[PDB]
Design a protein around this ligand. Sequence first.
Ligand SMILES: [Zn+2]
Ligand SMILES: [Zn+2]
Ligand SMILES: [Zn+2]
Ligand SMILES: [Zn+2]
Ligand SMILES: [Zn+2]
Ligand SMILES: [Zn+2]
Lengths: 136, 136, 136, 136, 136, 136
Amino acid sequence: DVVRVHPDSSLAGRKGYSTTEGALYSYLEGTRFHQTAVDMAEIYTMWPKQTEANEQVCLYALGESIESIRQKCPVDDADASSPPKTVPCLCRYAMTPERVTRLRMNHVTSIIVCSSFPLPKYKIEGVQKVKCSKVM
Amino acid sequence: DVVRVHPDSSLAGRKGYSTTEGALYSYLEGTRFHQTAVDMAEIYTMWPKQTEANEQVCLYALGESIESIRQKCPVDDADASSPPKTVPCLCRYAMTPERVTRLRMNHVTSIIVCSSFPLPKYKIEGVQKVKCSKVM
Amino acid sequence: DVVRVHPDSSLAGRKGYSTTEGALYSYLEGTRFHQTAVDMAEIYTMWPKQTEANEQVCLYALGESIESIRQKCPVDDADASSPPKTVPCLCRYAMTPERVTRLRMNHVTSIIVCSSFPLPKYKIEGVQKVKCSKVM
Amino acid sequence: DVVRVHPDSSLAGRKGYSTTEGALYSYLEGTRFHQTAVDMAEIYTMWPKQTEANEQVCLYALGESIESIRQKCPVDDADASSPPKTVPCLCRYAMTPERVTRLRMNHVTSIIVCSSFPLPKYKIEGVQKVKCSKVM
Amino acid sequence: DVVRVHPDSSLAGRKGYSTTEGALYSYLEGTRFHQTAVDMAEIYTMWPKQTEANEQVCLYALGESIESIRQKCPVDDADASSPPKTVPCLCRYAMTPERVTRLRMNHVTSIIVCSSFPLPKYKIEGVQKVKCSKVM
Amino acid sequence: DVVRVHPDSSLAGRKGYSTTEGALYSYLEGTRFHQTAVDMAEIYTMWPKQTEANEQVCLYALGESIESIRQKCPVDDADASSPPKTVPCLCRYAMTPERVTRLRMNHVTSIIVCSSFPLPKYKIEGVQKVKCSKVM
Ligand SMILES: [Zn+2]
Ligand SMILES: [Zn+2]
Ligand SMILES: [Zn+2]
Ligand SMILES: [Zn+2]
Ligand SMILES: [Zn+2]
Ligand SMILES: [Zn+2]
């Protein structure tokens, strides 16, 4: 089965990845983003509600270690992680595991997050919220 | 999709930008004005009503930092920012993100703002209000 | 009788092993994984409930000696070991005796375990829990 | 193929260069002006319309670095550069790559530009516009 | 069979190489450029689309190690490499394996690339895009 | 019966060996490559599928002992070995027993393997995959 990827994904036009069809959730096995993917997946289990889970994902993109993310979880409950969305949205600010990997490699001090990535209504340092131009 | 720009815009006659048709709202991705654009967009969220939002935008054009603009917001609520108007009007005083970028680069101590950019009825230092010659 | 093996098993396409049919439980006689298999089988007897038995199996995969595993058993009761599942699931993280053998040979410091391998709800060092893509 | 050069060019009467015939566009390979040529070519791509491209070329002749010229471009689009005109006109003020090289070497604070080099209708510091005595 | 080479190639006028006829693809066995050739070929497999493959080739010419190029590939898929074009074009900026070898030997900090070598529309450090004077 | 050998084989033009006709499979009795041949044959029995058998052959060419190759086999089943192909292909990278013998004598740290020698789609250390110029 082919894994659906973002149109701007570097996996586009590759064997096992497609832009117009495929699986919408994946750990991206066989790529480097795989690691980031599973880390993001673990985050989405540590915080069941999407808002503060996305806040922790944004902090992860800003270079914060995943170990501190595990530390910040209120409980020690550990459940199996579901694969993160490979295409959360279709704009250039989609918080895919690939984009998070790229931001962590670039060590960016600020990121731009679209509205398809719901965040806490209060300010987050290094995160700028913009409208999602086009959604999934 | 092409992004509609001002007739006096430096993006006129370029790939992805047009004067007679295109998107009327954009963060101007791929340009420098992009940064100014998103900043202006954030301002338009900090002040929901257009009058004092435009006052803050005018102060932004006069060189005041965006950090102080965030400080001046009465609340800490942060919602996703909608793209600013690329063509608020068709005169030479259109408060486009490009014009704001140019004014900030020139470090102007006074600006001229047309009537298509609604402002508070009281005086604003460094801002002169004139009639908009032609509107959108 | 043919022994059913994982699709990613190195025993696939060999005499006595098959992917689409065969025995679902085996000590894998005639292979090296045999040893690991019987060790895993012994673990599954030392801990009757699958959760902490799988925890001990995960620790076994992380390089911990089987002698310490025997030491950690609360009782000295020793009953005959049933053959471990050759195909616990169909994803790439199936905790087959072959996969455990490969992980022990590679001396990995961290493993990824799918949801078809039930584990304790608390954190286990060196183990990352992910959803099983496809099950048996 | 011979490259057509200006009658006042120092490449006149040389192998591969001619005054009465030859290629009207060239990067001037094998000369020093080559570098200036390609820089001018890049300018002509950064600004698609000839007017502000010629303004940037005039600023380049006045000693301004090409890096700042790249900075001043509104977009980051980079397309292949076409060779600049070796003979834009036949007067002594022809803005050939050779003339630009000579002006940059002399570090002139003011230049005279003929009417065959279309410029913005507003004043440019250090540039004096005169009629082109004879054109191509 | 003779291998067609660039008119400016140092292999011109040699046994097994010709300018007017021959094979248009080769690993250049028997030469030093052979190594560069196969490296370039591997690059063209790592990035299936010609644009970012040519970007990686340009970075290779700028002295970046091939090991880092392998690292930068999003996937670990490795398919057989097709021989690179010995004559991608007929101008002096043809990105032949010989030219890449010469540039790597000279340790150049900047290269000039013609339009027959398609590159990403954004800026690449140390690469200047010019029109290809004559094509294949 | 004559044994068909590679055109670049040192057995070419010898009694019992020919380039245009002969047996396509042989243990190469009477030569030194004989030993390598039978070793390769044994490898082709240890791994029934050609892909990982060729991977093990490539590792054998890189100097790894045949005893470790026997150790790496998942099973202890030992069936009679069929003679390896004396001419797997007609290019210079043909993985003949003679070429493997030469590479082992030279103790090469890297080899180039054509596409007629199918290998695993993942990277193999010391092996570079290129297109086979001409096949059998
Ligand atoms: Zn979005
Ligand atoms: Zn107006
Ligand atoms: Zn599973
Ligand atoms: Zn003139
Ligand atoms: Zn060219
Ligand atoms: Zn071959």
